[PDB]
Amino acid sequence: PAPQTSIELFLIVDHSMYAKYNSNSSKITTTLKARVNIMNAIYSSLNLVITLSGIEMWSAADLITVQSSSRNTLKLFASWRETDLLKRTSNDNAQLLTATNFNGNTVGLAYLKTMCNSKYSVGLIQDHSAIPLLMAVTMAHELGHNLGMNHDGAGCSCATCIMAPVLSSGPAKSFSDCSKHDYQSFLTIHKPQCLLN
Ligand SMILES: [Zn+2]
């Protein structure tokens, strides 16, 4: 919550989310930009700047098989980011934005404490809500996982903070004191270098 850091985030729109907005790049771009602007506000307290390295859209076909099983898709996506994306665009983290309905209760997924990692700095997000604050909180939540944050346990003194385990319809734009600690722990214990520049 103190070293001035920066995440160059890259967004990937899959073919199902492309078709859901009637194959229109402008609607998708503006939709995604509003949500990202909200993410920035959420993160300025941690002194962390989010920058969009770009937005890629799989307009013709999906570059990976997007499965309803979140687990598989996250792994398929991270691998594709390693071997393909990173050769074309430089980014500290990429987040797939899909219209596929993941199996079960899940609306997003990320790897814990992997920010900057060439193989694992990724997240998955289901376009499950039309309310931009809800989507921005979903995006901020998975990014929070890559940055080392766990979910807020009842013994965290917050049920509507960003890292709450399930989405609240009237969320706070705040990180609990547990989330701040996980983050300090990630900074000191993991020493993510890419974020400090
Ligand atoms: Zn979570």
* Residue whose entry in the numeric block shows the structure tokens 């009237």: 170
Sign, CA dihedral 185-186-192-195, equals negative
Resolution, in Å, please? Answer: 2.2
Examine the residue annotation and report whether 142 is marked as an active-site residue of this protein: yes
190 contact partners, CB below 8 Å, separation of at least 6: 113, 115, 148
Q: For residues 84 and 100, is the Cβ–Cβ distance under 8 A?
A: no
- Rounded Cα gap, residues 154 and 158, in angstroms: 7
Fold held by 1-197: Collagenase (Catalytic Domain) (3.40.390)
Q: For residues 135 and 195, is the Cβ–Cβ distance under 8 A?
A: no
Question: According to the annotation, is 141 in a ligand binding site?
Answer: yes
Question: According to the annotation, is 15 in a ligand binding site?
Answer: no
- Rounded Cα gap, residues 20 and 28, in angstroms: 10
Which member of 8, 56, 82, 142 is catalytic?
142
Gap from CA of 145 to ligand 1 centroid (Å): 7
Gap from CA of 26 to ligand 1 centroid (Å): 30
Q: For the chain, give the DSSP string.
A: --S-EEEEEEEEE-HHHHHHTTT-HHHHHHHHHHHHHHHHHHHTTTTEEEEEEEEEE-SSS-SS---SSHHHHHHHHHHHIIIIIHHHS--SEEEEEE----STT-SEEE-TT-TT-TTT-EEEEE---S-HHHHHHHHHHHHHHHTT--PPPGGGS-SSSTT-SS--SS--S---HHHHHHHHHHHHHH--STT--
Q: For residues 115 and 138, is the Cβ–Cβ distance under 8 A?
A: no
Q: For residues 166 and 177, is the Cβ–Cβ distance under 8 A?
A: no
Gap from CA of 37 to ligand 1 centroid (Å): 21
Q: What technique solved it?
A: X-ray
Gap from CA of 140 to ligand 1 centroid (Å): 10
Cβ count near 149 (within 10 Å): 26
Gap from CA of 134 to ligand 1 centroid (Å): 14
Q: How many Å separate Cα 3 from the centre of its chain?
A: 21
